[PDB]
Structure 1
Amino acid sequence: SGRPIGVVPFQWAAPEDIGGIVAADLRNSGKFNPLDRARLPQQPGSAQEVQPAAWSALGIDAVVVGQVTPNPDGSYNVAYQLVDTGGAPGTVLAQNSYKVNKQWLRYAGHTASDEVFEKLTGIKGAFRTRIAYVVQTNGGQFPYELRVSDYDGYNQFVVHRSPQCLMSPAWSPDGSKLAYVTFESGRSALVIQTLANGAVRQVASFPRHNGAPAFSPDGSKLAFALSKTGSLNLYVMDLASGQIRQVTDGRSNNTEPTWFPDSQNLAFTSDQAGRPQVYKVNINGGAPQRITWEGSQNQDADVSSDGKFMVMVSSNGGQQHIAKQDLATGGVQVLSSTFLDETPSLAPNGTMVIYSSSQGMGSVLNLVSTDGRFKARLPATDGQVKFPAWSPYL
């Protein structure tokens, strides 16, 4: 399902397939169905060449065309036009042209993907965003790497290598820092590493596990879990002052915080009710309220950027899957159908979830659209991939 759309190969072999990147981006969102290239009624190299009737006949009311031309310095100019083939046939609804170096050609595609997706959906695009994750490689000296790539797995690079367990990277709201758990000292530590220079800020090294970091949306606070008291409880550090407050204190267990849009409430996983469930607590007034009542287990929650819903890992009758629960209704929809579905992360526009599964025996992350309509594997990595984290808008 999804809106059918015509995505035409761009006019030029070309250094990159921009039309294919746009089609794949729009499809990954679940909201679009780019017309099979083999069934396109034409391959127009320009909006002028678009014959709207031939696209409307196939149920397509808009067509993406474009041009890639080389520049004398070896860079390329990439231009796109979106041609209405519905109520305003042949009209160009949006278009652009701009100069990029070859190494950003894939980014160029995402740029087009960002605009058309928004033009046709009114939703800000997330195709130029990035994901962070931890890879356990087969290298001996630094088997653990915290890495970042494009949302679709391309343009991977390593942010930090470690001989010891890494967990739970977390983006600052500006996309400039990653908080994460590092055990290089021989036990748990929470640190914030600046991507631009790789500088690492030490956040916490209490006697036991310091984990599950989360940056407040406004950037002022970091949530995390400490067991120094004897058990995992939620704590928040004011990033300006460095002062640490405790949010939960009790024999119940409280961890895996995620921030609500208000930067004042956390959702998190607790066993207060037995099997893991999701609870909500104010970082000031501490008294957790259970918010997950469907299924038999609920854990690993992530609150949407508008706060209307969250995604999580839910267990209902033996089956654990990535599910989405509306935060104002409790309605749960199962999204994923893979095995060992774990650690989902939401795009900042709420349209796609990245998570880890049994795919590739752990070595593959998967994307699923938040409408449930599309599922795909990311390009395989050279290791086991865990703890994916979707960057903010970049």
Structure 2
Amino acid sequence: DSGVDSGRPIGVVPFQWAGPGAAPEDIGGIVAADLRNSGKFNPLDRARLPQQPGSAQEVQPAAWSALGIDAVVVGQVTPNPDGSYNVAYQLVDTGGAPGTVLAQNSYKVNKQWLRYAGHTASDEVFEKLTGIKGAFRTRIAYVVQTNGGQFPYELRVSDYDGYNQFVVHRSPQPLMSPAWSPDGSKLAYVTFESGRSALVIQTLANGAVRQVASFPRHNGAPAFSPDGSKLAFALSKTGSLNLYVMDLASGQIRQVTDGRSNNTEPTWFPDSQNLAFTSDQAGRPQVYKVNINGGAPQRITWEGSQNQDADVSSDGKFMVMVSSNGGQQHIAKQDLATGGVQVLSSTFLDETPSLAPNGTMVIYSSSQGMGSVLNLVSTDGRFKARLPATDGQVKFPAWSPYL
């Protein structure tokens, strides 16, 4: 819903490093990358910075408004004797009230939390300048297939931008489609470890695992309801996949769809009652919507030869999905009210899109020979980037809720 050329230009100056040598991290670089990733901003190339002020007072507004820049982010990174660091940023106005500090904060963090300090600065500048909750301190879950033979599959979690990865679960068999609990503490996912498909929910903090379902099938594509009370997923035995809803408090499972049609990849609407999902009911896959509390499925995608793997935004205003047309398979966004569709990505064979909690960015995977990598694309379509390559093929990314 930004629908413009580039984003709002903004000056993000490298942070001053008072400590000896060089800085342990490029905080300004992180803030710029974050802001840019959202498609909401176009940080000025470090090449064209008119100056590199190290403090708000050193900022000369005229130099920035001149280049069409409303605000400038300046900052300082200072080493503490205990080995930790002080990361401070000041958001300085270079427009209506030149030189005034719109926002500033300072954080004391260990080397390991320096990127977090950067993402915090980004979140603050972001919420202050867009009114939209920042998602820069969010994480993503995904599955990497390494080249190791014993446990090729690793369900991992990392910062949304690919850094600070950690393994949640390693498996000798395929792992797929993790899904975050709304409170960000658990991941549901499908594992073939038992030899056949199973749906589990693992608590990230202690690794605890809850068995949910095992009926005969393949990928269950789980999805937690926004309110935390249910988990929707697909089971395929009768010869076709159908939707089931898991009541998390009681464990009672109820079938939400029936028929010879393959109904899968459920995703929740904000009300925790309606699901959007993929069905082959009309031939090539299309996206349908159904209220778990009663009613028959309602096809909702009409544009495109095929649409699947939907992800409804947190505000229910739109959804992203994999849309195939003219031999191109990309992530597309569909307005849930007016039905307009906008193709976001342009990479090769885009799959499983997952919306950032503020709905400003989508993480998805694309094809690379026999493998695949993760990508980010802002929901306004302005920014596209590969996430940092890792030691394996990556699939099924899932963006965490706000943390």
Cα displacement (A) at 1:361: 5.5
Work out whether 1:118 is the aligned partner of 2:127: yes
Residue 229 (structure 1) shift: 3.5
Q: Does 1:281 align with 2:290?
A: yes
Report the Cα offset of residue 320 of structure 1: 1.5
Per-residue deviation, 1:261: 0.4
CA, structure 1 residues 340+84, in 2 after alignment: closer, same or farther (shift >3 Å)?
Answer: same
Deviations 1:250-290 (A, max 9, x none): 22221110000000000000011010000000112041000
TM-score (norm 1): 0.98
SS in 2 for 1:357: strand
Contact 2:239 2:260 (C-alpha < 8 Å) held by counterparts: no
Question: 1:210, 1:224 within 8 Å by CA — same for their partners in 2?
Answer: no
Moved more, 207-216 or 173-182: 207-216
- For residue 67 of structure 1, report the CA deviation from its aligned partner: 0.6
Q: Render the CA deviation track for 1:161-196: whole Å, top value 9, x for unaligned.
A: 011111110100011110000111100000001111
Give the conservation status (yes or no) of the 8 Å contact 1:359–1:365.
no
Alignment correspondent of 1:28: 37
* Worse-superposed segment, 229-238 or 46-55: 229-238
- Sequence identity of aligned pairs in percent? 100
Distance 2:373 2:213 in 1: 31
Structure 2 distance, partners of 1:334, 1:384, is 24
Moved more, 224-233 or 85-94: 224-233
Assess if the C-alpha contact under 8 Å between 2:285 and 2:308 holds in 1.
Answer: yes
Q: Deviations over 1:308-341 (max 9, x none)?
A: 1000011122222110000001100110111111
Q: Is the 8 A contact 1:269 1:279 kept in 2?
A: yes
After superposition, give the CA deviation of every residue in 1:280-313 in whole Å (9 maximum; x if it has no partner): 0011204100000001111110000000100001
Q: Does 1:65 align with 2:74?
A: yes
- SS of structure 2 residue aligned to 1:20: helix
The verdict on how the C-alpha distance between 1:210 and 1:57 changes in structure 2, with shifts beyond 3 A counting, is closer
User: Structure 2: which 5+ runs fail to align?
Assistant: 1-5
Contact 2:140–2:399 under 8 Å retained in 1: yes
Paired residue total: 394
Q: Which moved more, 1:267-276 or 1:350-359?
A: 350-359
> 1:362, CA displacement in angstroms?
3.1
Q: Deviations over 1:29-59 (max 9, x none)?
A: 0110111111111111100000001100110
Distance in 1 (alpha carbons) for counterparts of 2:130 and 2:179: 28
Unaligned runs of 5+ in 1: none
In structure 2, what is the Cα distance between the partners aligned to 1:283 and 1:92? 49
Whether the 8 Å contact between 1:204 and 1:210 is mirrored in structure 2 is: no
Q: Distance in 1 between matches of 2:284 and 2:353?
A: 19
The answer to whether the 8 Å contact 1:210/1:227 transfers is: no
Per-residue deviation at 1:359? Answer: 4.4
Residue 341 (structure 1) aligns with: 350
Is the 8 Å Cα contact of residues 338 and 359 (structure 1) preserved in structure 2?
no
Shift of residue 360, structure 1, vs aligned partner:
7.2
1-structure distance, mates of 2:328, 2:365: 16
SS at match of 1:364: strand
Secondary structure of the equivalent of 2:295?
A: coil
1:91 and 1:121 mapped to 2: Cα distance?
18
4+ runs of 1 displaced by more than 4 Å? none
CA separation of 1:338 and 1:201: change in aligned 2, threshold 3 A: same
Cα deviations across residues 69-92 of structure 1 (Å, max 9, x unaligned)? 111211011111001000000000
Post-superposition CA distance 1:328-370 (Å, at most 9, x none)? 0110011011111111110000110000012475342100011
Counterpart-to-counterpart distance in 1, 2:109 and 2:165: 19
Matched-pair contact (CA < 8 Å) for 2:10–2:72: yes
Deviations 1:111-137 (A, max 9, x none): 001011111111110011000001111
Matched, 1:193 2:202: yes
1:230 Cα deviation after fit: 3.3
C-alpha distance after superposition, 1:225-270 (max 9, x if no partner): 0123332110001000000001001222211100000000000000
Secondary structure in 2 matching 1:141: coil
Indicate if the aligned counterparts of 1:360 and 1:380 stay in contact, CA closer than 8 A.
no
User: Contact 2:177–2:219 (CA<8 Å) still a contact in 1?
Assistant: no
Deviates more, 1:353-362 or 1:289-298: 353-362
| Secondary structure of 1:46's aligned partner | coil
CA distance in 2, matches of 1:362, 1:337: 17
